[PDB]
Subunit: 175 residues, 6 copies
């Protein structure tokens, strides 16, 4: 089942992301239920917006806000919800939402899946438009479902992304 996928072949450089929401999909927010392993409908998003990249998480990871680290994965074609993709982390989006800090990593497909991202080694290598899209998406997608709000503090590098992997992996085995 999806609950027994490994975090990565070699964390934090070489990880698996479990995809929950494909890039450019209808505005249905899916989430994998941690008891069943099944895809749950979490909500029907109320803004006319879409995730600019595939969205999911690293299994066996516990972030400070109680859930596994979440990750955005650019691909040339949208992936199936429930699929698992081998990636390498390249950067991190720092925000605050109503409960203090949130981070969302960006990870690119690993070279065994594709060579089109070989030259993206860090956060400054990502296209500027795509970074600006992601930031704009996270600042507005909950505008109409409020008591909710997000603010974007800015981009960090591959080493900050890796640190967040490692600390949340470690945090999982214990609490």
């Amino acid at each position: 089942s999806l609950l027994n996928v490994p975090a990565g072949k070699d964390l934090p450089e070489d990880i698996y992301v479990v995809i929950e929401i494909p890039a450019n999909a209808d505005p249905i927010k899916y989430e994998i239920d941690k008891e069943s392993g099944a895809l749950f409908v979490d909500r029907f998003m109320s803004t006319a917006m879409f995730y600019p990249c595939n969205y999911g998480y690293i299994n066996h990871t516990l972030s400070l806000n109680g859930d596994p680290v979440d990750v955005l994965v650019p691909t040339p074609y949208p992936l199936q919800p429930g699929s698992v993709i081998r990636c390498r982390p390249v950067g991190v989006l720092k925000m605050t939402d109503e409960a203090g800090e949130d981070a969302k990593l960006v990870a690119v497909p690993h070279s065994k899946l594709s060579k089109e991202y070989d030259h993206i080694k860090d956060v400054n290598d990502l296209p500027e438009l795509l970074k600006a899209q992601i930031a704009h998406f996270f600042e507005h997608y909950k505008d109409l479902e409020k008591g909710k709000w997000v603010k974007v503090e800015g981009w960090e590098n591959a080493e900050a992304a890796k640190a967040e992997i490692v600390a949340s992996f470690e945090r999982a085995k214990n609490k």
Copy 2:
């Protein structure tokens, strides 16, 4: 796995439907296999028709005809086969097919997923065109795969829908 999703948070008011066939899909009839939990192709439907709502079942339920209670779930966008959606029952379609009574519930997305169905509290609140579509679909979708035939006896209320949940949940733990 899909075999360990709960029937509901609070049956019969607050249930989970396991989606097998999305609204407006190609005419492939999928079914979740109760031994494996996997999506099986049940048949390629022979009429040029589509399910007017997402179609699936409540887990841990046994109806009088040997299978879990089946349910139609209107959403603003079609859902993935295998996904699980939180809903509240609002009515029931009564038919007879070659083996006596069949019921199919209608349940709407629960308010935590969407507010667009808050005002639908019972069977008379459903749009008339959608009810007429569903009835027409169930009367004709098997026209070309005969020895099969369906006749529609008519709509019942939210309390009859809830009763069918409860009796089939109870019926499951025992036989």
Copy 3:
């Protein structure tokens, strides 16, 4: 889970294929991970080509190259990745790739799912264009991802297809 689907109701005449790649899809090569049962992204294909039929495998089978027997399944509409389809084998495509012989079966939907393939009993009953498409796909889809190359030796009959099922089923229980 997908790891506990049976090879077939009655091997080798009556088998289940686990679908990994739908017909006519984006050029994402998915594969079911044999440890987890989950759909993995195997690679993003580099040619502008698509599988001309749905593609997958028979569970509980071990071919000579270390993986389960793979199968192409024509359907009137593309199937979901992860779905299971009841089929009957009708022929086999023989190739050599860099590691000696490869076979890929063709199996058609079983008559309980559809009647549109009833008249296809063997390999000469398949439309010639579809056979020529499949051969052309397998000869070129890896042209740009080389150190890889495929050559097509030609079509065999339903009895050779069945033999390959049986030998790989037997080969699985033991090694």
Copy 4:
């Protein structure tokens, strides 16, 4: 302009069909406007049905119900609305509705487009399932339209289809 497209390269054996509704599309009934040549929305279909083949008309023809002769065209992938396809007539579906008698031709793609239809020379060569679905569609797609009924009378051969096209071509000029 679509108003200037010919009736065919060689009537009645070699014709063009202007496509109004794609096979397997959403339940929106499009029509070419005669004055402007633009694609108009004639209506949203109220049954959960789709056209089993692409649908349109032959330009410069006038049937006795006072519009261009309509044709149904099977193709391996749906066509774009407003597109023009070269075809051969193979049959006619005769029916009666609440306005009187009607007739629908069936034409396959010309050999210059595709060889896949070269063995279909007449109405009994069409796959039995397609004929059954086309008939069932015409008899039920207007069922939720108050006042509108369709009764299918039977099929007629290629020769009957050719005569309708000649008759209706002549009648478009001479009047």
Copy 5:
């Protein structure tokens, strides 16, 4: 030609809208060219947003910003670009941008197309969520366009929508 389509069957109560951008489509902003009547790509949208309704214009109208009056049209399925829809105005969205004042009409499908919109007679009858999404879209779709801003001023009723159409129709001739 789309340049020859009428403004409406009976202005301002019964109009035609030429559709430029489908609801829920890829983020490509199409426009009909005035000279040629062809569909041009005006631009690729840079936010991750989609139009919440089909968008287009009324032909033979000229607003005080010097183009045809635009309309937003909700429909149950997205429409084709270049297609013409018969509609009734029910409201107007007033806004200001970096070029000055602007106004966007909202029109529903005429009763001849669909009865589903017959209870919507005016701007307060639109579903509350659709109005909120349309406003939010206009206020944010140009956020990554340097120099371009939108401020939404409020809604106005059906009567205001009719006056804009008359005013702009007259102004298209008399000039």
Copy 6:
């Protein structure tokens, strides 16, 4: 009419391309008819291949093979058939086929449409994988067409692309 669209705002640096075949579409080869300006089906492709970019032509140009100059245009989402895109030439693909020599231009979206292509000034700036896929497509898409072959000769720069457009524009008038 598409027959009246200009060759470009400022040839040869700023051109319009009329789109005939979308990137990543079904294997239907569309062409604009010269007389009518309608979209015709030229053929159903017989290989399992798709165009790796949108394909079309520049109006009011005539190449030495006696039709308009064709162009391949990469865009972030597929375009509609019949739509017109503003572009800049950056390269040419030279080949020979069974009718003789041929050439295919590559043009990216103009800066007014999208800034994403502003760093692509010439043929060596295109992503290496796209060039490889375009070449491989042209060399294999007609492989199952009896009598038809394609041999790719090499690329040429933006300057060569501009000269072809001038040459073919002049040749469209003066004749």
